[PDB]
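Final report, results section. Input specification for complex C-07:
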Amino acid sequence: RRGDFVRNWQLVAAVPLFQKLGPAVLVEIVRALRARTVPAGAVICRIGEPGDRMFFVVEGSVSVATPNPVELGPGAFFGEMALISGEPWSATVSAATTVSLLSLHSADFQMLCSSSPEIAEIFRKTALE
Amino acid sequence: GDFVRNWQLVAAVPLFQKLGPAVLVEIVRALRARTVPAGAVICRIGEPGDRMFFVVEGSVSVATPNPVELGPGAFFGEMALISGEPWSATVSAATTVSLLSLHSADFQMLCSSSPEIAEIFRKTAL
Amino acid sequence: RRGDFVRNWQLVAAVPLFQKLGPAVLVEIVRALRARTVPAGAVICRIGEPGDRMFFVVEGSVSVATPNPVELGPGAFFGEMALISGEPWSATVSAATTVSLLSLHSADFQMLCSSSPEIAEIFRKTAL
Amino acid sequence: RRGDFVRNWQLVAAVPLFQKLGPAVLVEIVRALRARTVPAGAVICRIGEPGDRMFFVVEGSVSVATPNPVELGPGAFFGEMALISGEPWSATVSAATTVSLLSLHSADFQMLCSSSPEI
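Structure output:
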């Protein structure tokens, strides 16, 4: 489906970290994404484990193991500091129902610094942080 | 213009799955639109819930571990729509966010026109 | 498909005669629509034949038999006038490709006067 | 607003002329598009004039000057031969209601078939 690409763009464009990134850039961000079906109950990211990627919950809902547990349905995303630095996950997130995941690996978003200055400026901005 | 955009957003919600076109068009008409600046608290922990929210533009943030954010096409507060339970997490705007909300009262008042809405309440009540 | 309903609503909502209609009224009109698939070359409406229905071209393009052979793609509609009066077609429109048709018959539209005040207001403003 | 952009993308991709084109290029087309809203009654393009651009209907309806006028609604497009070539508009098109439109100028379209010759 071609409409899936659009809705993925729509999700990607909505990321605060990506606000000053133009259309051309966003496309290649979307093209880099990796699709993964996750069964109900299965872990997506462990607490305290090395975050090397960002996640996008296209269809289905996810459970969040926190001081206050919350099930968050479709159109959800997390892991911005896993892209930029090597921040470990502050909470275990798992699939509440059948989950349709899209994943941005920190390697691919990084390999975009050569062609995109706006992305390059994200990492440099993380000098004092 | 916005109506069709709102129809499809609402029609994506599983709670509204078994609903019909005539019922759905009335729900869209009941929606309220609001644009919130980045940082402003939308709904707060512990406070009672009286509406359901839809993200149209931008993305909101859930304050638990500040991990999960919700972008366009996302929704929250299904149970605060039917029953009236307080929110399990504080939600606020990460960016400038365009939102729709369906007030619980306006949804409850559609039992008059929809056996399906009434059934949702009959099961939820018991 | 529920997806097709919203596309049909959107086209109906764009009809000049239908502008002063609320979202709920447009639902009854879309519910009244009749679907047909018509092969390329077939006549949708023939000049001089009585106009008893309005047409919506959901998929495919249509050709108008004007001295200039024009092809007008999907999202096309005509025969708005055929709901008001019995006036015959001024031209012949035919399918230029495979066409998915939607049809609102003048009779089905007419008896929505008892259902909804705005349609009844359309007939009053006409006859006045 | 990324709202209009997404709407414009899905709109142009539904048009057959752009079907066999990749996500990378459809975007550049969309950026090259210009938006205008026209009042009911106003002439968008005249018969016999110079065919400069292609048109996409967003909201409202335009009308084509046929004996019993044919209207084009949201998702409709017109003026294709004004890109593949540059010939007189074969019929006069005006606004039936208040119409929101997208337009692609033959300048930009040609200036984008060099980057990706797919047409």
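Helices of chain A lie at 2-13, 23-32, 80-84, 106-110, 117-125. Chain A touches chain D at residues 2-3, 5-6, 9-10, 13-14, 23-24, 27-28, 30-31 (CB under 8 Å). This concludes the modelling results for the funded period.
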